[PDB]
Design a protein around this ligand. Structure first.
Ligand code: NAP
Ligand code: NAP
Lengths: 342, 342
C-alpha cells in the first residue's frame, strides 16, 4: 500500500487518517501533533504511530512527560512516506512545503487555507483529477470550493453555465472551537463583493473564469455552511433533469424539508443517527424543494459539512498524485465504498 | 393634531407611539395591551393612556389587580381616533381590520406581516406615498421590504433595473425574545426559491414585477438582518454614482469596514453610543467597501435594524392617508427631523 504520513492531526488531519486506514491500498505510517493533549492520546489509542510535528527535542520531552508515547519528530518519519497529507493551520502548510516537503523530495497535499499559487494545481475529484495526475504538490481546495465544484459539475453535466451567483452563509466556529465568535452578529467576510470564493472555484475549473460571482458572511452557528445559488445556463433543462443530475453526481445527496429537514441542525441529526463516524456527512446536501428553474436560470440552496466534505477528496488526490488509479470515477467509487458514503 | 391610536404596544407599536409623539402635527390618544406586564407599566409611566386591547371585563380586572392604570378598552377609545396604527401579531392585524377598524369606520395602518391583498395599498415613502394618498386601509411593508425599497430607489435613480437578485440572512429572534430559536442552525425560510420576499417588493413597486429574485435563511442572531444584492442594470453607472445616490437617498446611510464596522454588532454599538432611543437605527445601512460595479451589475451588502426600520414609514403613511402633506419628500424630511435620523 501507499505509505501516507498525516502532518497535523487536527480537524482535517484526524479524519484523513481514518479515511486512509479504511482504504485497501494505503496506510497511515504516522500522524503528528504539537501539543500533548487528549487528541494526541486518542491518536495513540487508535493505534497510530504518533510523531511530534515540529522537530524540537524539548517538545518531544513534553509529550514523554505527559505520558504520551511518541516515535520521534516529523524528521524521523518523513523519509518513509510516499506522500504527506498536510493538516497544519492556514499559512503553516506552505511553511511545511518549503521547509520540509520540498527539501526531503516527498510529495505533499496542502489543504484549502493555503493559496492556489503555493502549489502546482488544485484538486477536486470531478474536475481536476487528471490535471493533478502524477503531480508532486497539490492543494485540496476548501470546504466551500469543494461544495461549489460538485453542484457546478452537476449543472454543467446538463447545461453550459453562463453565470453562477452564490451567497455563502458560513459557520463561525467548528463545534470543538470554544474561542472564536461572533456570539451574536452577522459578519461580512469579506466585505468586498464579488469575493475571493469565486476565483477559488476557477483555480479548479479554469473555464469558469468570469462566470462565478460570490459574496459571503459569517453567522453564529457551528454545524454547516449554507450556499444559495442562482445560475444562468445555456439550455432548456427542467427541475427533473437538475434533480436527476444531482442524484447522479457522486458525493451530492438530497433532503426534503417535507421529510422534516427544516435546517442544518436536522441534517447533522441525520448524520448522528445514521451512525456516521464523528457524525460526518462528507456529501454536499441539497434541499429538494429549493430546486427550481425559471427561464434558463437554476435556483437551489445547499449545505456543506465543513469539517468533512474535503476528506474523500484527499483520498482521491493521493491516488492521482501517486498514479495509483488512472480513472477518476474509479477512485471516487473506491473511496466512497471504503468510507461508507455516497 | 392627527389623533393616532396605537392598537398593540409591542416592538413596532411602542416605537410608533414615541415617533408620533415626536411630531408636531400628531398625537397618541392611547396605546393598547393584552397583558399587564412591565411594558404596560412603562407605557403608563411614559404618559400614554393605556387601554385593554380586547374588550373583556375579566381582562380589565387583570390590569386593575396588577395596579396598572387603564382607561378602559379598545371600544372606549376607537371612536376618537383619526387613524389606528395596528401593531398586533401576524394575522391579528387583518382580524382587527375586519372586526374593529371597518365596523367603526376608522382608517388603519397594518404592519408588514399582514398581506398585500388584505389592504388597499402597500406603503413606502419613496415609492408609493402618492398612491396611498387619502386611502383608508394601507399596509406598511416589512423590515426587509422597506430596506429593499430604499436601496432599489437609490439604484433606480441612476439606472434602470433589469434584475435584482437578493439573499436575505435574517435574524432568528428580536433581542427581547428569549423563546424563539434556532440556537445553532441555518434555516431555509422559506426552502423555496425564488421566495415571497421579491413579490412583496412588487406590491410596492408594480414595475418591478418579474425583476426581483429573492432567497432567505434564518441564523442565530438577534441584532440585524443582512441582505446581499447583485443587481443587473441598463445604463452605465460607476461605483461613485451609486455611492452618491445612496448618500442622497433619505434613510440610507453608509459605514466603512475600514472604520471598524466589522459586523452588525458594530453597527448596533454605534446606535447605542450615538444615544439613539432603544439604540434604533431606522436608516438602512450599506457597507461602503461592498459597493461595486462589474459589467453593468451592481453589488453591495446592507444591514437592516428590523425593529426600527419601518417606524418613520408609519409616520409618513399617516400623513398620506390623512392627506396632511402632498409632497412625499416634505413628509420624509419632517418625520426625519423630528426623530433625529437621516
Ligand atoms: N476546519 C474546516 O472546516 C476545514 C475544511 C476544509 C479545509 N480546511 C483547511 O485545512 C487546514 C487545517 O485546518 P483544521 O481545521 O484541520 O485546523 P486544526 O483543527 O487547528 O488542526 C491543525 C493541526 O495541525 C497541527 N499543527 C500545528 N502546527 C503544525 C506544524 N507546524 N506542522 C504540522 N502540524 C501542525 C495541530 O497540532 P496541535 O493541535 O497539536 O497544535 C493540529 O493538529 C487549513 O488550511 C484549513 O483552511 C479546514
Ligand atoms: N419585530 C420586527 O422586527 C418587525 C419589523 C417590521 C414589521 N413587523 C411587523 O409588525 C407586526 C407586529 O410585530 P411586533 O414584532 O411588533 O409584535 P409584538 O412585539 O409581539 O407585539 C404585538 C403587540 O400586539 C399586542 N396584541 C396582541 N393581541 C392583540 C390584539 N388582539 N389586538 C391588539 N393588540 C394585540 C400585544 O400586546 P401584549 O404584549 O399585551 O400581548 C403586543 O403589544 C407584524 O405584522 C410584524 O410582521 C415586525
Amino acid at each position: 500500500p501507499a505509505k501516507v504520513l498525516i502532518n497535523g492531526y487536527g480537524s482535517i488531519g484526524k479524519r484523513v487518517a481514518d479515511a486512509v486506514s479504511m482504504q485497501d491500498d494505503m496506510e497511515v505510517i504516522g500522524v503528528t501533533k504539537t501539543k500533548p493533549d487528549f487528541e494526541a492520546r486518542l491518536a495513540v489509542e487508535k493505534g497510530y504511530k504518533l510523531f511530534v510535528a515540529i522537530p524540537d527535542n524539548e517538545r518531544v520531552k513534553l509529550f514523554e512527560d505527559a505520558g504520551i508515547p511518541v516515535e520521534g519528530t516529523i524528521l524521523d518519519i518523513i523519509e518513509d512516506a510516499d506522500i504527506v497529507v498536510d493538516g497544519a493551520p492556514k499559512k503553516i502548510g506552505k511553511q511545511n512545503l518549503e521547509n520540509i516537503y520540498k527539501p526531503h523530495k516527498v510529495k505533499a497535499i496542502l489543504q484549502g487555507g493555503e493559496k492556489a499559487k503555493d502549489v502546482e494545481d488544485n484538486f477536486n475529484a470531478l474536475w481536476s483529477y487528471n490535471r493533478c495526475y502524477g503531480k508532486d504538490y497539490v492543494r485540496v481546495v476548501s470546504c466551500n470550493t469543494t461544495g461549489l465544484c460538485r453542484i457546478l459539475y452537476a449543472i454543467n453535466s446538463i447545461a453550459d453555465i453562463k453565470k453562477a451567483r452564490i451567497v455563502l452563509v458560513r459557520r463561525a466556529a467548528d463545534p470543538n472551537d470554544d474561542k472564536t465568535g461572533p456570539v451574536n452578529a452577522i459578519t461580512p467576510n469579506p466585505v468586498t463583493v464579488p469575493s475571493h470564493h469565486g476565483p477559488d472555484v476557477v483555480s479548479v475549473v479554469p473555464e469558469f473564469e468570469g462566470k462565478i460571482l460570490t459574496s459571503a458572511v459569517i453567522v453564529p452557528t457551528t454545524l454547516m455552511h449554507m450556499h444559495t445559488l442562482m445560475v444562468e445556463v445555456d439550455g432548456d433543462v427542467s427541475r427533473d433533469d437538475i434533480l436527476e443530475a444531482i442524484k447522479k453526481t457522486p458525493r451530492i445527496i438530497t433532503v426534503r424539508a417535507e421529510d422534516g429537514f427544516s435546517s442544518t441542525a436536522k441534517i447533522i441529526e441525520y448524520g448522528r443517527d445514521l451512525g456516521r463516524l464523528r457524525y460526518d456527512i462528507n456529501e454536499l446536501v441539497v434541499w429538494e424543494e429549493s430546486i427550481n428553474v425559471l427561464e434558463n436560470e437554476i435556483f437551489l440552496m445547499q449545505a456543506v459539512h465543513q469539517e468533512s466534505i474535503v476528506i474523500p477528496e484527499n483520498i482521491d488526490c493521493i491516488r492521482a498524485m501517486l498514479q495509483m488509479e488512472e480513472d477518476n470515477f474509479k477512485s471516487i467509487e473506491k473511496t466512497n465504498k471504503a468510507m461508507g458514503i455516497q
